[PDB]
Design a protein around this motif. Structure first.
Motif, PDB file in Angstrom:
ATOM      1  N   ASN A  71     -12.916 -22.516 -55.514  1.00  0.00           N
ATOM      2  CA  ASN A  71     -12.559 -23.720 -54.779  1.00  0.00           C
ATOM      3  C   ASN A  71     -12.797 -24.884 -55.718  1.00  0.00           C
ATOM      4  OD1 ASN A  71     -12.313 -25.900 -53.173  1.00  0.00           O
ATOM      5  ND2 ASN A  71     -13.436 -25.007 -51.451  1.00  0.00           N
ATOM      6  N   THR A  72     -11.728 -25.291 -56.402  1.00  0.00           N
ATOM      7  CA  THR A  72     -11.890 -26.268 -57.469  1.00  0.00           C
ATOM      8  C   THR A  72     -12.450 -27.579 -56.954  1.00  0.00           C
ATOM      9  OG1 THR A  72      -9.595 -27.083 -57.339  1.00  0.00           O
ATOM     10  CG2 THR A  72     -10.076 -25.293 -58.913  1.00  0.00           C
ATOM     11  N   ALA A  73     -12.117 -27.954 -55.719  1.00  0.00           N
ATOM     12  CA  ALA A  73     -12.619 -29.212 -55.177  1.00  0.00           C
ATOM     13  C   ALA A  73     -14.138 -29.259 -55.189  1.00  0.00           C
ATOM     14  CB  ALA A  73     -12.106 -29.407 -53.756  1.00  0.00           C
ATOM     15  N   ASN A  74     -14.799 -28.128 -54.941  1.00  0.00           N
ATOM     16  CA  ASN A  74     -16.260 -28.165 -54.903  1.00  0.00           C
ATOM     17  C   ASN A  74     -16.808 -28.595 -56.258  1.00  0.00           C
ATOM     18  OD1 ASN A  74     -16.419 -27.409 -52.253  1.00  0.00           O
ATOM     19  ND2 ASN A  74     -16.723 -25.228 -52.693  1.00  0.00           N
ATOM     20  N   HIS A  75     -16.161 -28.139 -57.331  1.00  0.00           N
ATOM     21  CA  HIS A  75     -16.584 -28.485 -58.678  1.00  0.00           C
ATOM     22  C   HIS A  75     -16.211 -29.914 -59.011  1.00  0.00           C
ATOM     23  CE1 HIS A  75     -17.841 -24.456 -59.670  1.00  0.00           C
ATOM     24  NE2 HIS A  75     -16.840 -24.068 -58.896  1.00  0.00           N
ATOM     25  N   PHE A  76     -14.950 -30.288 -58.773  1.00  0.00           N
ATOM     26  CA  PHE A  76     -14.519 -31.636 -59.113  1.00  0.00           C
ATOM     27  C   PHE A  76     -15.300 -32.681 -58.330  1.00  0.00           C
ATOM     28  CE2 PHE A  76     -10.123 -29.538 -59.838  1.00  0.00           C
ATOM     29  CZ  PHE A  76     -10.567 -28.995 -61.019  1.00  0.00           C
ATOM     30  N   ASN A  77     -15.597 -32.396 -57.063  1.00  0.00           N
ATOM     31  CA  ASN A  77     -16.397 -33.325 -56.268  1.00  0.00           C
ATOM     32  C   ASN A  77     -17.822 -33.428 -56.804  1.00  0.00           C
ATOM     33  OD1 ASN A  77     -14.262 -33.964 -54.601  1.00  0.00           O
ATOM     34  ND2 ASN A  77     -14.824 -32.495 -53.022  1.00  0.00           N
ATOM     35  N   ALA A  78     -18.443 -32.294 -57.137  1.00  0.00           N
ATOM     36  CA  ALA A  78     -19.796 -32.331 -57.694  1.00  0.00           C
ATOM     37  C   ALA A  78     -19.817 -33.077 -59.021  1.00  0.00           C
ATOM     38  CB  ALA A  78     -20.351 -30.918 -57.862  1.00  0.00           C
ATOM     39  N   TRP A  79     -18.821 -32.836 -59.874  1.00  0.00           N
ATOM     40  CA  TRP A  79     -18.726 -33.573 -61.129  1.00  0.00           C
ATOM     41  C   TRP A  79     -18.650 -35.068 -60.866  1.00  0.00           C
ATOM     42  CZ3 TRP A  79     -14.397 -30.240 -63.840  1.00  0.00           C
ATOM     43  CH2 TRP A  79     -14.912 -28.950 -64.083  1.00  0.00           C
ATOM     44  N   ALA A  80     -17.786 -35.484 -59.945  1.00  0.00           N
ATOM     45  CA  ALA A  80     -17.622 -36.909 -59.667  1.00  0.00           C
ATOM     46  C   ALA A  80     -18.916 -37.523 -59.150  1.00  0.00           C
ATOM     47  CB  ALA A  80     -16.507 -37.093 -58.636  1.00  0.00           C
ATOM     48  N   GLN A  81     -19.606 -36.810 -58.256  1.00  0.00           N
ATOM     49  CA  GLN A  81     -20.903 -37.243 -57.747  1.00  0.00           C
ATOM     50  C   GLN A  81     -21.865 -37.554 -58.883  1.00  0.00           C
ATOM     51  OE1 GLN A  81     -22.797 -34.218 -55.023  1.00  0.00           O
ATOM     52  NE2 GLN A  81     -24.184 -34.006 -56.792  1.00  0.00           N
ATOM     53  N   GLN A  82     -21.800 -36.765 -59.956  1.00  0.00           N
ATOM     54  CA  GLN A  82     -22.701 -36.886 -61.094  1.00  0.00           C
ATOM     55  C   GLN A  82     -22.210 -37.883 -62.134  1.00  0.00           C
ATOM     56  OE1 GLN A  82     -24.967 -35.534 -59.048  1.00  0.00           O
ATOM     57  NE2 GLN A  82     -25.878 -35.327 -61.080  1.00  0.00           N
ATOM     58  N   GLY A  83     -21.061 -38.514 -61.905  1.00  0.00           N
ATOM     59  CA  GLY A  83     -20.511 -39.470 -62.847  1.00  0.00           C
ATOM     60  C   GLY A  83     -19.534 -38.903 -63.846  1.00  0.00           C
ATOM     61  N   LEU A  84     -19.036 -37.684 -63.625  1.00  0.00           N
ATOM     62  CA  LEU A  84     -18.084 -37.010 -64.511  1.00  0.00           C
ATOM     63  C   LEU A  84     -16.717 -37.154 -63.852  1.00  0.00           C
ATOM     64  CD1 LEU A  84     -20.031 -33.783 -65.493  1.00  0.00           C
ATOM     65  CD2 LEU A  84     -20.132 -36.070 -66.533  1.00  0.00           C
ATOM     66  N   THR A  85     -15.990 -38.194 -64.266  1.00  0.00           N
ATOM     67  CA  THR A  85     -14.725 -38.589 -63.656  1.00  0.00           C
ATOM     68  C   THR A  85     -13.579 -37.824 -64.290  1.00  0.00           C
ATOM     69  OG1 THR A  85     -15.540 -40.823 -63.279  1.00  0.00           O
ATOM     70  CG2 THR A  85     -13.135 -40.537 -63.323  1.00  0.00           C
ATOM     71  N   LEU A  86     -12.644 -37.372 -63.455  1.00  0.00           N
ATOM     72  CA  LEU A  86     -11.401 -36.779 -63.924  1.00  0.00           C
ATOM     73  C   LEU A  86     -10.255 -37.746 -63.695  1.00  0.00           C
ATOM     74  CD1 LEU A  86     -11.661 -33.206 -62.445  1.00  0.00           C
ATOM     75  CD2 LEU A  86     -11.653 -33.746 -64.873  1.00  0.00           C
ATOM     76  N   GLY A  87      -9.316 -37.746 -64.630  1.00  0.00           N
ATOM     77  CA  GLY A  87      -8.111 -38.521 -64.464  1.00  0.00           C
ATOM     78  C   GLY A  87      -7.014 -37.740 -63.781  1.00  0.00           C
ATOM     79  N   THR A  88      -5.783 -37.937 -64.228  1.00  0.00           N
ATOM     80  CA  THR A  88      -4.654 -37.234 -63.646  1.00  0.00           C
ATOM     81  C   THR A  88      -4.556 -35.856 -64.268  1.00  0.00           C
ATOM     82  OG1 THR A  88      -3.144 -38.105 -65.323  1.00  0.00           O
ATOM     83  CG2 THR A  88      -3.444 -39.404 -63.306  1.00  0.00           C
ATOM     84  N   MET A  89      -4.318 -34.863 -63.430  1.00  0.00           N
ATOM     85  CA  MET A  89      -4.381 -33.485 -63.885  1.00  0.00           C
ATOM     86  C   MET A  89      -3.193 -33.148 -64.770  1.00  0.00           C
ATOM     87  SD  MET A  89      -7.228 -32.647 -62.691  1.00  0.00           S
ATOM     88  CE  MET A  89      -7.840 -31.048 -62.155  1.00  0.00           C
ATOM     89  N   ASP A  90      -3.484 -32.471 -65.872  1.00  0.00           N
ATOM     90  CA  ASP A  90      -2.460 -31.803 -66.661  1.00  0.00           C
ATOM     91  C   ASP A  90      -2.489 -30.331 -66.245  1.00  0.00           C
ATOM     92  OD1 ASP A  90      -0.674 -32.791 -69.181  1.00  0.00           O
ATOM     93  OD2 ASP A  90      -1.289 -30.699 -69.442  1.00  0.00           O
ATOM     94  N   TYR A  91      -2.388 -29.376 -67.167  1.00  0.00           N
ATOM     95  CA  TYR A  91      -2.305 -27.986 -66.745  1.00  0.00           C
ATOM     96  C   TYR A  91      -3.664 -27.470 -66.286  1.00  0.00           C
ATOM     97  CZ  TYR A  91      -3.808 -26.453 -71.490  1.00  0.00           C
ATOM     98  OH  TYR A  91      -4.500 -26.240 -72.673  1.00  0.00           O
ATOM     99  N   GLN A  92      -3.597 -26.377 -65.526  1.00  0.00           N
ATOM    100  CA  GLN A  92      -4.757 -25.800 -64.858  1.00  0.00           C
ATOM    101  C   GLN A  92      -4.471 -24.311 -64.776  1.00  0.00           C
ATOM    102  OE1 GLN A  92      -5.181 -26.603 -60.501  1.00  0.00           O
ATOM    103  NE2 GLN A  92      -7.081 -27.603 -61.189  1.00  0.00           N
ATOM    104  N   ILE A  93      -5.221 -23.507 -65.531  1.00  0.00           N
ATOM    105  CA  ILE A  93      -4.945 -22.080 -65.642  1.00  0.00           C
ATOM    106  C   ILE A  93      -6.233 -21.280 -65.507  1.00  0.00           C
ATOM    107  CG2 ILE A  93      -2.877 -22.413 -67.058  1.00  0.00           C
ATOM    108  CD1 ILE A  93      -4.525 -21.699 -69.539  1.00  0.00           C
ATOM    109  N   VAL A  94      -6.084 -19.984 -65.242  1.00  0.00           N
ATOM    110  CA  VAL A  94      -7.163 -19.043 -65.488  1.00  0.00           C
ATOM    111  C   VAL A  94      -6.938 -18.519 -66.894  1.00  0.00           C
ATOM    112  CG1 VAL A  94      -8.328 -16.992 -64.825  1.00  0.00           C
ATOM    113  CG2 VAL A  94      -7.331 -18.423 -63.054  1.00  0.00           C
ATOM    114  N   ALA A  95      -7.902 -18.761 -67.789  1.00  0.00           N
ATOM    115  CA  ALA A  95      -7.733 -18.495 -69.209  1.00  0.00           C
ATOM    116  C   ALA A  95      -8.834 -17.612 -69.774  1.00  0.00           C
ATOM    117  CB  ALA A  95      -7.761 -19.813 -69.974  1.00  0.00           C
ATOM    118  N   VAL A  96      -8.429 -16.752 -70.697  1.00  0.00           N
ATOM    119  CA  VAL A  96      -9.332 -16.106 -71.635  1.00  0.00           C
ATOM    120  C   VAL A  96      -9.312 -16.917 -72.923  1.00  0.00           C
ATOM    121  CG1 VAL A  96      -9.791 -14.047 -72.947  1.00  0.00           C
ATOM    122  CG2 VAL A  96      -8.969 -13.830 -70.587  1.00  0.00           C
ATOM    123  N   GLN A  97     -10.479 -17.375 -73.339  1.00  0.00           N
ATOM    124  CA  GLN A  97     -10.653 -18.077 -74.594  1.00  0.00           C
ATOM    125  C   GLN A  97     -11.487 -17.188 -75.499  1.00  0.00           C
ATOM    126  OE1 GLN A  97     -11.554 -22.237 -74.409  1.00  0.00           O
ATOM    127  NE2 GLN A  97     -12.395 -22.288 -76.486  1.00  0.00           N
ATOM    128  N   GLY A  98     -11.126 -17.113 -76.765  1.00  0.00           N
ATOM    129  CA  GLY A  98     -11.908 -16.362 -77.723  1.00  0.00           C
ATOM    130  C   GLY A  98     -12.166 -17.175 -78.974  1.00  0.00           C
TER     131      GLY A  98
END
Length: 191
Positions: free
Chosen positions: A152-179
């Motif tokens: 539930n991405t909202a739970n994270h984005f809301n918690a981030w905002a509460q803590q002062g971690l602001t997001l702008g306008t969304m670009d891409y959003q994926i489930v990713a494997v990073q190596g």
């Protein structure tokens, strides 16, 4: 394995992004629906996965499959915002390296069956979706590692905002494997 060409586009209705640093040792394929697979052996740096372009701030992202890293790798909900430029991660699992090691902890959030620890880091004059830049990264790192579930991405984005971690306008959003210079395999289906 087989592979597609690095790039972005659409496959079976889903946005995908596959990038690597040219080192070799990684293959990425798109499967039916929201499925993708990654196999890697003594890779360089890479990121690959499926999702949406643009993302939203209230998406419930479902993922399922297998993730078998051998070395440094992450499995995350991953994306960017613009204005401000932010690279963000909701990390569901990882390999040998917890990406928050040494980072400043900015709080906790409980979502989808686990506590997550929240962090901010900074990338200095590094590649980004708009060119070389200095920008913050936001992290929610799941304590209870898994390779299926719902985010539930909202739970994270809301918690981030509460803590002062602001997001702008969304670009891409994926489930990713990073190596990062590692080996492994993964097979993930997104919806």
């Amino acid at each position: 394995g087989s592979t597609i060409q690095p790039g972005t586009g659409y496959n079976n209705g889903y946005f995908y992004s596959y990038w690597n640093d040219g080192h070799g040792g990684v293959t990425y394929t798109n499967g039916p629906g929201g499925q993708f697979s990654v196999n890697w052996s003594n890779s360089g740096e890479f990121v690959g996965g499926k999702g949406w372009q643009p993302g939203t701030k209230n998406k419930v992202i479902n993922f399922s499959g297998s993730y078998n890293p051998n070395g440094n790798s992450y499995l995350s909900v991953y994306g960017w915002s613009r204005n401000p430029l932010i690279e963000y991660y909701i990390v569901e699992n990882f390999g040998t390296y917890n990406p928050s090691t040494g980072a400043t902890k900015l709080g906790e959030v409980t979502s989808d069956g686990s506590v997550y620890d929240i962090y901010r880091t900074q990338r200095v004059n590094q590649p980004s979706i708009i060119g070389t830049a200095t920008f913050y990264q936001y992290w929610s790192v799941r304590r209870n590692h898994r390779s299926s579930g719902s985010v539930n991405t909202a739970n994270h984005f809301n918690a981030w905002a509460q803590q002062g971690l602001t997001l702008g306008t969304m670009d891409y959003q994926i489930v990713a494997v990073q190596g990062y210079f590692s080996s492994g395999s993964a097979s993930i289906t997104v919806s």
